[PDB]
Structures are given as C-alpha cells and as structure tokens.
Amino acid sequence: TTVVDRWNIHPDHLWLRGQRPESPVVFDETQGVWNVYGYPEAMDILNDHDTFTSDLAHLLPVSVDAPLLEGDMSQMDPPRHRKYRQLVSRAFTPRLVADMETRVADITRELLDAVDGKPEIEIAADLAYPLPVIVIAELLGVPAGDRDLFKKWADDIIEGFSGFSFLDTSGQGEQDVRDATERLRPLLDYMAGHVTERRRTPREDLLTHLVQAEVDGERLTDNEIVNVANILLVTGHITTTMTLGNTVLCLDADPEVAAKVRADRSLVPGAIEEALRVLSPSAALARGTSREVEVAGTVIPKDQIVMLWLGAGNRDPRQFTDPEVYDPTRDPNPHFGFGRGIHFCLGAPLARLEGRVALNALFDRFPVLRTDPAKPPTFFPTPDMIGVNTLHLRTS
Numbered sequence: 001t002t003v004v005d006r007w008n009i010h011p012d013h014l015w016l017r018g019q020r021p022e023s024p025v026v027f028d029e030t031q032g033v034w035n036v037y038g039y040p041e042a043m044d045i046l047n048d049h050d051t052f053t054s055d056l057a058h059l060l061p062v063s064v065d066a067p068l069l070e071g072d073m074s075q076m077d078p079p080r081h082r083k084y085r086q087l088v089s090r091a092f093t094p095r096l097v098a099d100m101e102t103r104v105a106d107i108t109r110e111l112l113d114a115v116d117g118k119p120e121i122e123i124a125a126d127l128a129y130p131l132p133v134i135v136i137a138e139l140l141g142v143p144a145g146d147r148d149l150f151k152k153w154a155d156d157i158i159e160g161f162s163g164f165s166f167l168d169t170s171g172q173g174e175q176d177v178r179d180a181t182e183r184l185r186p187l188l189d190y191m192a193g194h195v196t197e198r199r200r201t202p203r204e205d206l207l208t209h210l211v212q213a214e215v216d217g218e219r220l221t222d223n224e225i226v227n228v229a230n231i232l233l234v235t236g237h238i239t240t241t242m243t244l245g246n247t248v249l250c251l252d253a254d255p256e257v258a259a260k261v262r263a264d265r266s267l268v269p270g271a272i273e274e275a276l277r278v279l280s281p282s283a284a285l286a287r288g289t290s291r292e293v294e295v296a297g298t299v300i301p302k303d304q305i306v307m308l309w310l311g312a313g314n315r316d317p318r319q320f321t322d323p324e325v326y327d328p329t330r331d332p333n334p335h336f337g338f339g340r341g342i343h344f345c346l347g348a349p350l351a352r353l354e355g356r357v358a359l360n361a362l363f364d365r366f367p368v369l370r371t372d373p374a375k376p377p378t379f380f381p382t383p384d385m386i387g388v389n390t391l392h393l394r395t396s
C-alpha cells in the first residue's frame, strides 16, 4: 500500500496511482491547455525553450488580472533571462550554500530543542516550515534580532512575492497580491538599506555577491537586487517545507525502508530525491508555444498553453521501473523535481542541504515517529502542488 493510497492523496490525479492516458500529450478543452504526461516528451519540451517559452502574459485571458512580479526569472524569457541568470548564479553559488551547513544545523537544533520529549509533534509548524524561512533570511543579511520583524511581515511577503500561478489563480487571489504589494515600502526600504551597505562595505555574503556580479561589466541595479532578494525570501520556501514533510510521510508508509534509512544515513538524500519523484511539490509547469510543433504525433498550434505534469512524467514506466514504488536507493534518480533546462531550480542545493540536515537531526532526536489517524496528515488544496501542510507525529 503506497503513501498515496494510504492517505487518498489528490484523488483527482489518476497518474498518482498508475492510471495514465494512452497518449503523452492530451489536449483539454476546459481548461484550454495541452496536458503532457510523458517523461521523454517533458524532457524534450523543457530543453526546447525557444519553442516552449516561459513568459505567458500574452497567453492569459483578460479574466486573469495578475500583477507582474518584478525579477521573477521563471516568468522571464531569453535574452533577458540569460543575463539575469548568469548574474544571479554568480552570487547564488554551491560554495555559499555549503558554507551555511553549520548555521543550518544550529537553527535546526534550536527548533528541535523546543519540542524535544513531547509525545506528539507537528512537523511543519515545528521544523519544516520555520527552517527555510530563517535560513534564507540570514543568507540575505537579516540578523536574528530582526526575526520578530519578519514574522510580522510573513504573510504580506508571500502574497507579494509568490508569483504566478496559472492553475491556482483567482480574481480575489490576485486582488490580495495587489493589496499586500501596497504595504511593502518598509520591506523594500529594508532591503535597499542592506544593499547600500554591502556596496559601501563589501562582505563574503549573498547580497554583496549580487552587487558585485559582473559578466562583462553589465550588472544588476540596486532595485533589481532588492527584487531578487525579496523573491528569494519566498520562492522554494513552501516547496522546501512540503519536501521535508513528504519525505517523512513516504518513510512512515514503509516502516522497513524507514528503519533502513535511519540505520544508514547515506540514504537520506536519496530518500529526499525519491520523495520529490513520488510526491512532487512542483507537479505542474506551464509553457507557451511560439510556433506549431508536433509532440509525439500530436500537433500543437502556435500560442497555446502547455501544462507539463512533471508528477506524471516522474512515474513514466518508460523511464522508471516500478514507478509507484518509493525506493530511496534509485541511483541515479533523474526526476523533474527541480525542472530541467535553462530554468532548472536555482535553490536546489540549498533545498537538499536543509533536507539532509533537518532529516538527520529529526531521526537523531526522535527514534520513533508514526502518523496519527486521529490527527491525519493534511495536504495543500492546490492541484499543481503535492505536499503536506501539516504532519502530526507520535514520539511513541
């Protein structure tokens, strides 16, 4: 019995149980998008960014009244995206992430210290959710003493810098984004002050590296840097906590694999990777056709919206043997969890670091963790995001 069937996870998604359409590409008419379920097809689509573009503004109906989030690279197309990515990736580096490990462990310990010994913890509220927030804030020059100032802004930040948002958008939803954005002057004055400081007295940190990022002299403006930082405050945050909770849920569902993983911590990252393939926080990606293109015998007209169901592609039997089986030992595990191509997830090594550190400490602190049917795991309502929003676990 899989983790999906145990908790009746997203019953709307049949591919979560191996029920797949015969064709990889199936046009909807609802819902006027082209759904892609196949692994080789998704790979082809993701690699061909020219044919399958990422800026969908011209493709959205006037019913979609969405505020454009400044600096959002995922909604951005080349050549501008290329320059923006070259620059941001000059700063957001593997070395900077790796150097954060001790800090991540220290934050993780403090969080676990608060609930150590309790007969029941809730994984999201106690660990999975606060950790990515604090970690990314410190990377952006937010000192500990200013945590109360950021929990204060917590709600407004995420409404104001979440972004789009095709499947889940509503009129009232976008309305909320606008209102939050109207109350963000003091956050953007906050970031601007730290950017001005890093340009004045440079440090070995992210904000400074964003200021100094070069590529033949062509740099980011202070305003673009502030926008990059504010976006980073929320991008990957929710998905990171989902990923943390999803891994534990997959492990709970199979006590023998859980025991094996606890015994052999070298399997932790693999268990995290496998959870991303099994329960995808980013289940759906949107692309726009720039021309008429044939994908697997299916002709897609120009200016059509393609929905890449990465969760389904992650279960394509052509690519994955026993696709419905959570197996942390899969090596390699070329899932679509972080995407593929010029838009490949930038925060992936940070996500993987927080995951490995948090998981190992959780197992260390709590030798026994089991779900409660009286307090069942809940899930995000969204169709494009497959992750837990709450976990209740027994110390037992």
Ligand code: HEM
Binding pocket: 054, 073, 074, 075, 085, 136, 232, 235, 236, 237, 239, 240, 243, 281, 282, 285, 286, 336, 337, 338, 339, 340, 342, 343, 344, 345, 346, 347, 348, 350, 351
């Ligand atoms: C488990 C956690 C995460 C998952 C599952 C995830 C998922 C993804 C996916 C699927 C994409 C590709 C989007 C596309 O092709 O349109 C992406 C891109 C991106 N990610 Fe993540 N993400 C995670 C964490 C993070 C974190 C922690 C950060 C930064 C602190 C981050 C920053 C970004 C940015 C800036 C992009 C856009 C890159 C571009 O468009 O060139 N992500 N993410």
